[PDB]
Amino acid sequence: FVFYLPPDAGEKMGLSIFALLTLTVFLLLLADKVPETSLSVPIIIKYL
């Protein structure tokens, strides 16, 4: 929905990059749950 925001509102970065920040927070959330082996990649990490 950032592409539906007008350019004259001046809020495209403040939305999309903060979504990126929230995604980093969820990466921190999963940092202590997933296996640490390197034979394959978890599908949830692929999705993230």
């Binding site: 296996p35 640490e36 082996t37 034979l39 394959s40 978890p42 599908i43 949830i44």
Partner: protein, 193 residues
Amino acid sequence: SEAEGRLREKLFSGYDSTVRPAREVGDRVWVSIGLTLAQLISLNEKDEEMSTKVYLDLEWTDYRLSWDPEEHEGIDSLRISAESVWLPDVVLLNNNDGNFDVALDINVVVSSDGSMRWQPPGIYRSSCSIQVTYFPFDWQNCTMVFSSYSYDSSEVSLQTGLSPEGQERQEVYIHEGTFIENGQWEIIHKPSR
């Protein structure tokens, strides 16, 4: 019971608990191994280890521990401390923490024909190779390998241990009333080979 004491003295006169029961040289000891899962504690992925609480079910025959019940006031069974009789050296081979043994030393039930039944409890941290590709929608195949550490096939022979039902089982036994399922894991198949 005094008759019980006299029976125990008669049975353990000249008995060596470190010597395998084999009347003739070349005789094997047939050991029947079953397992009852009391609780699946955990599957830790970061350590690749499954923690379980189990009861083993070990059955064999010691010819030296037989008696006539009619000569001992009708006693046809005994409950003897496990350190006093010969045990098979059955261990969990794929342990992950360095522990091979059972959790508690309990009694062995000895019948008048020499049949030995030992059902020790155990807590086991066995090795599981986690397949991570579909985590957390994954299923895992965790094995518990039990074997005699010392005796080879010419001395101790293993077989799958029968359930209380008198049929050739191939399955881990789970008591459906007293088993609380793990909140993270569902047991689909639980065979034994």
